[PDB]
């Protein structure tokens, strides 16, 4: 699925708007978040461990058989983390964090995991991106639907300082756990400001987002949210596009710090190549 990407069965398709999307549109020229609405993020996926039944990370559905996430969720040697297809399963269509959602969610097994060959776990998580092929295609529904991948022009016009994106996840609410999927809208921050907030070498394959100390508003992703989608709604065709992947941050919601995200468009060629070959 991809011709109908970014159009939510319970919102766009019915001409209904969610509680906070206007905030995103008005800016075009999870800690401190809120409960998501049912069907608000139908591409949200839960990365899950089979052994101790645990939430590992968030992820997103980009087609009936492909899930996108952060590579650190799968491979992070400094913490002795190195998962294979058989160590995980994906849960699509969820709202409740712990509750197994009978008749609503779908569970899939992984066929193959592809980690960007130049993923830099040794230093700054440069190119923190991974693709996962589902063993069997997932059937879409009101709660399951793929998000679109950005094209050059969508990335050009939307990825600007001040423009707000949206992050969703079942991660920690503070640096305990939410009962349902949380959502927070955050503004993209100027690259210089991102660089000057950390000692870590940031690259062109990343962007940071969050409110500045003087802005009053707060919000950020936290443990459990990584691998999840940072999305924006295009004001041109009204579809939702995944601009980033929750990558890293120093703590959660700390003043003067910002969440960092993988720049999806810059790595789009690797995505296309992988899906076109495998």
């Amino acid at each position: 699925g991809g011709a109908d990407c970014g159009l939510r069965p319970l919102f766009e398709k019915k001409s209904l708007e969610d509680k906070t999307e206007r905030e995103l549109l008005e800016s075009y020229i999870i800690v401190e978040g809120s409960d998501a609405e049912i069907g608000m993020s139908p591409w949200q996926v839960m990365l899950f461990r089979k052994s101790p039944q645990e939430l590992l990370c968030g992820a997103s559905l980009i087609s009936d058989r492909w899930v996108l996430t952060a590579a650190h969720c799968l491979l992070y040697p400094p913490w002795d983390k190195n998962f294979t297809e058989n160590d995980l399963l994906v849960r699509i269509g969820k709202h409740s964090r712990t509750r197994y959602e009978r008749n609503i969610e779908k569970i899939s097994m992984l066929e193959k995991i592809y980690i960007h060959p130049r993923y830099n776990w040794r230093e700054n998580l440069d190119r923190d991106i991974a693709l996962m092929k589902l063993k069997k295609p997932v059937a879409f529904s009101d709660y399951i639907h793929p998000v679109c991948l950005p094209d050059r022009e969508t990335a050009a016009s939307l990825l600007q300082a001040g423009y707000k994106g949206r992050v969703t996840g079942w991660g920690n609410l503070k640096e305990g756990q939410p009962s349902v999927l949380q959502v927070v809208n955050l503004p993209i921050v100027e690259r210089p400001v991102c660089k000057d907030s950390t000692r870590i070498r940031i690259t062109d394959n990343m962007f940071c987002a969050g409110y500045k100390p003087d802005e009053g508003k707060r919000g950020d992703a936290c443990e459990g949210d990584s691998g999840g989608p940072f999305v924006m709604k295009s004001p041109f065709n009204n579809r939702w596009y995944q601009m980033g992947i929750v990558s890293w941050g120093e703590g959660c919601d700390r003043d003067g710090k910002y969440g960092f995200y993988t720049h999806v468009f810059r790595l789009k060629k690797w995505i296309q190549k992988v899906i076109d070959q495998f």
Binding site: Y76, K81, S226
Partner: peptide, 12 residues
Amino acid sequence: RXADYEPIPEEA
């Protein structure tokens, strides 16, 4: 950073 559950029935 860096990266309670109900058992999943044998339904996948």
